[PDB]
Amino acid sequence: KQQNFCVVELLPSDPEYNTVASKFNQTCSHFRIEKIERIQNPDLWNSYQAKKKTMDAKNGQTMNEKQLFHGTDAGSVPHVNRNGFNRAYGKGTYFAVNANYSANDTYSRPDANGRKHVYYVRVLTGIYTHGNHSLIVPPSKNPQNPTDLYDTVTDNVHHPSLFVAFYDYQAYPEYLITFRK
């Protein structure tokens, strides 16, 4: 209901820290990471976890969760910590498999400080397929009962570089990376 939240800065020389970053620096090493913050919103975590449990029931052996990158403007950050992604491949939120997709300044706009922002996000990819621009939601998995859909969409199922989610509680903004270049 009241998705209040706190922002904890990760200490350089931490496990959790090095892990994130690692994956970030994996394509964005030419970048200077000013700060990294974990975002703690119990209401988002709950609504997300619930979502996962019911997917964990639905998709058999599937690995529903992925940790993907997302870049926005500084102005969006506050909204994201509170609200976390509220309402060519469709109209949803785009997450990148690799940090560098997100680093484009069309996405992670730079502020006056030239400081940039990318969330390292828990996304319930679940079962996915190729998406197209005419998508407000994911396509049905079969034509017979068009009711049961996919969980998300990608550019390429056998070697995706991005996922597009369409629902209000499918991602949790666990970390915020602030970097400079």
Ligand SMILES: NC(=O)c1cccc(N)c1
């Ligand atoms: N904004 C993003 O992180 C992103 C991810 C994948 C694709 C696009 N176009 C954007």
